[PDB]
């Protein structure tokens, strides 16, 4: 399974130090930058928490949340079997919380060392959109801090590569703030 | 215009050192991975060539070259006018340009002068599909025109992981240096 990602980290994320730790954030957002091309979320919003964890939302149309046909809802199939990578940050995460906003409601769910709980449906929202909050193993890691200027630095180039969507980035650490959005 | 892009480059590139300088080749190389996202290319092969150009092919369907509704074919329209395709601004800031297109059965030639566009040159029947992007970045602009093989390796390596299953190979013809990106 996703033991596989944490024996040999470096061949699904390159390496350990701060590059493969960057490029937990690199994976989630691309899905997202993913979910623009596709011609639905206009946004990207990425937060630095002070806890350690990077919370990625966008307002797509929401990982599907339904059961899918291996007998466990798609959202739990995204995240945990191996052009989305998101179960290899979830198997690099000690813990990885996903808020989905898709068919009139607000759904919630969270892995324990990747292992999912319950999928919690509640609060009814015409809104839609996929949250990703991710811890990163500092065990797995050499470092689990982020560099604030990294992350600006390749925001700053996706939303070149990707006119007219917004990337928005808080480093909650300092209150640094930066909005990428160009013709 | 594109002098534009060429009077404020950073307004479009970000800077004019060696990020904005590198930032030419994920420009090119994010459009064709584009056209493997799309479900036609399976691979984009990127040489550094010892004259200062970069080239990059992909076996995606190839950049139309039928007469566009506006003018110009869609290649020049492509490469001169400012959905997620920004080629015309390395095109602007280069020195010149040269597109190989394959598609309806034949291999496509156009080339650009300091953005001006030459003939469509047709020529050579062939079964294959493709594009192949081959740019000078303009020393005037750039602080510096020496792309570094560890900063190409290590973005395309990122791109491989990033889209698992697609090919990139990388060649950096000023030293025979190779690398071939594929995971999974
Ligand atoms: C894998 O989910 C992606 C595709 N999604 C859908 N796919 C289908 C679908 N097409 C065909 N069959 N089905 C069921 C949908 C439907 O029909 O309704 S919605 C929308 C959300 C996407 N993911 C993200 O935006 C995303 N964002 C972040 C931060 C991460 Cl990380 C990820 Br991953
Ligand atoms: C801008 O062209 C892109 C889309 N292309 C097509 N689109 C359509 C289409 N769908 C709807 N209407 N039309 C006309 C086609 C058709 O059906 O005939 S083909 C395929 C090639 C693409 N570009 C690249 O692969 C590319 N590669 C590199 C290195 C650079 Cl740089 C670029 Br840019
Ligand atoms: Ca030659």
């Known amino acids: 399974g ?9 061949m699904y994320i390159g ?5 493969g730790l960057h490029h937990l954030i690199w994976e989630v957002v691309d899905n997202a930058v993913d979910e623009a091309m596709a ?4 946004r990207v919003d990425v937060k630095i ?6 919370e990625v939302r966008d307002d797509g149309r929401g990982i599907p949340v339904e059961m899918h046909a291996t007998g466990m809802p798609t959202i739990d199939v995204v995240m945990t079997q191996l052009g989305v990578g998101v179960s290899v940050v ?5 813990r990885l919380e996903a808020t989905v906003l898709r068919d009139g409601y ?13 999928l919690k449906q509640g609060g009814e929202t015409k809104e839609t959109g996929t949250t990703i909050r991710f811890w990163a193993d500092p065990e797995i890691f050499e470092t689990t801090d982020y560099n604030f200027e990294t992350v600006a630095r390749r925001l700053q180039e996706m939303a070149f590569l990707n006119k007219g969507l917004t990337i928005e980035l808080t480093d909650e650490r ?4 930066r909005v990428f959005h160009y013709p």
């Not at 390496?15 to 590059?19: C, K, L, Q, V």
């Not at 979830?90 to 000690?94: E, F, G, H, M």
């Not at 300092?174 to 703030?177: A, I």
């Open 15 to 19: 390496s350990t130090g701060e590059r």
């Open 2 to 10: 996703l033991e596989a990602v944490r024996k040999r980290p470096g």
């Open 90 to 94: 979830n198997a690099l995460s000690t």
């Open 39 to 42: 011609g639905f979320a206009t």
């Open 106 to 118: 607000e759904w919630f769910q969270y892995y324990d060392r990747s292992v999912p709980g319950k």
């Open 49 to 54: 928490h002070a806890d350690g964890s990077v």
């Open 174 to 177: 300092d209150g640094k703030h």
